[PDB]
């Protein structure tokens, strides 16, 4: 059971994005697309760093996007996290 | 002469490289024959000597011939390994060092960690004139020269790679030289690159398979002084046979965990031994003579030996090999001691080994 | 950040592409410090946010303890959790990790002998092996090989590899000697 | 042929009970666990034989005084004075013993080769009784899976 | 086998609707789409 649990964690992390949940098949239409998406676009470390930046930045000094995210975070509303959508899927017509 | 010897040398090298595996497998068969003959080796009565029992009398000359044959085949196997698999190792090492020089600057921008034997030994081959002797890319020196020549200094890079400084300029320009012939021993000495062969010999001596074959040769030699050293050649079944590797991988897949389980068992038995030494000592008399006891838990070390050896090998635990605790003040305590020992050590700790092997299979 | 935003929102503009190569060094210097996430903006569209990541934050994130915490968190959310609490658990883990790395940053303010012995053994033993050739006394074996014979050639062929094997044995003995001298 | 031989000796009809494997199909599921890794089960026995041969070589060369299997002081029952006899002893009694070869030989306490004998017995128990007999269990369970 | 059976039940219930049988991939084009579909649209408790 422990072996299967570790294998399941590995398989999920390798075949599904942690944030948006889109599988690697969609992202791997451009070479290394899944790696680019999971290390540059939807990096959970990047989200943690953004939370740190938003907390340490003064409230009056936020931009509008930062203020939007800050208000959602203060209300504990997680609709600003992309779920099933991404930049590539949104602008697939324009990007490609 | 100087060409015929090279031709015959190449013929022998090709033969041994071709038949490396055949002699490698023949050595195992000869070892099995020797060890089967050894099963009829009695001891006869001080200065005692071992005698080879035989009704036919053909057993001893056959054993001597088989031992000599095994030694010869082991030597031939080392020669075949050197002819066949050493060039691949040299090629891989040369490719690795060349690519670390080019795409990592291993000896220009950085340096080895001073505790990596491979990195420190590879310093010798960079300056050699016979570099990529096996690697195809003959332009690695020029490539590193172009890459790191400007910023790190052209002369410094040339000295690091052991390239010519000014003779090439004059040779593209005008110069004159005198010929030589292969028959000149001085010419052969100049042709031979001492430093590159030094590095090659170091790499071969560091190779893990050449060392194993050398150990095989060493025990084959020792088998002539003592015929029972040929038994160590039956450990070669794991390497020679590939189907036995599937079975043996179950043990070695969780190899570190199997060692850590034994360590945990040792710690648990040490705790039980501490408890016994502090509370249950009268129960560890292992003698039937009423006059003289055989107290096996009057010393910490002795009680630990007893628990690790007899208690662990016992099928019911330490309680199968000590005095019965009935009718004693510490009766329930001894019962709990024995039951917990049986459950944790005999049942649980010995089940983790089974589970590790089965999980390796799966 | 401005250049990255322009490039990533104008992915096929040749003028901007040729303008970016004039800022490669700046963009390479600021690459580790340039944050980039994606959010579902107030205009009901996926938007990309660019922020700053501090060197201290990155160094504390790359610490082994934080890596172990992240691994355990990922294991827990993949196995024992669902999507319906995924982002809440992720935010909680982010908060705990942020506090831990801030505390770590504020509290943190500003064998080789065996390898050398083995290398020396290799050098010494190989030099001793090569000294038969570096002795320049090959005249004796030349006079032996004047009466060239297949037996003599095969004997020399076997003797070279026997000498190699003896050199390896001497090297192994020297390794044992060096190890035993170092431990004692 | 065995049905005919059963008339001369009525106990040859016992060999017809080996027909349960063929006649019954539900017993085939149980018997396939043994026969699925059939070659590996034979190779495991071969490896066990080799390991016990190595242990027997070690005993014959170093531990011979410990293999007296007689209570009569006058006449010994030396079971490791011959290579073949010591190998029979190790393969039969030592393997079938629940603690290894150390359960059936003389106690090594108070001897020059005491720690050596302890290591011998413990390694035999671990490698043969515990590990080599665990590979069979693992092979059967893996065949089931 | 019992562990695998329970895991299979969990996987089927998490990746496929009980009533219509459409996978969660189609429904998860709107955030929390599968949960909305399986708890408001095709709820087996609602059918009962
Ligand atoms: N949102 C995400 N953020 C980061 N990685 C993701 C994400 N979604 C999927 N992944 C994938 O999960 C993998 C797991 O990365 P993880 O952090 O465990 O290891 P790593 O970066 O290779 O290094 P290490 O664990 O040694 O620090 C990533 O390499 C990536 O391919
Ligand atoms: N037709 C369906 N009706 C209900 N749930 C469905 C349906 N199809 C798929 N599901 C999924 O199966 C899951 C199993 O729900 P289940 O009734 O077992 O547990 P629960 O609602 O979380 O609570 P509990 O079991 O503690 O009462 C649901 O949460 C839902 O995501
Ligand atoms: Zn994503
Ligand atoms: Zn439905």
Curated annotation (Swiss-Prot), chain B:
Per the UniProt entry, the disulfide pairs are none
State where the protein is found. Sarcoplasmic reticulum membrane
Whose protein is this, by species? Homo sapiens
- Give the domain section of the comments: The calcium release channel activity resides in the C-terminal region while the remaining part of the protein resides in the cytoplasm.
In the UniProt annotation, what is the result of changing residue 137 to A? Answer: In VACRDS; decreased function in release of sequestered calcium ion into cytosol by sarcoplasmic reticulum; changed ryanodine-sensitive calcium-release channel activity; mutant channels are less resposive to activation by caffeine and store calcium overload; affects channel sensitivity to cytosolic and luminal calcium activation
**This protein is called what?**
Ryanodine receptor 2
Q: What is the lineage of its organism?
A: Eukaryota, Metazoa, Chordata, Craniata, Vertebrata
Query: Quick one: which gene encodes this?
Result: RYR2
PTM description: Channel activity is modulated by phosphorylation. Phosphorylation is increased in failing heart, leading to calcium leaks and increased cytoplasmic Ca(2+) levels.
For this protein, the parts annotated as crossing the membrane are 25-45, 71-91, 221-241, 260-280, 341-361
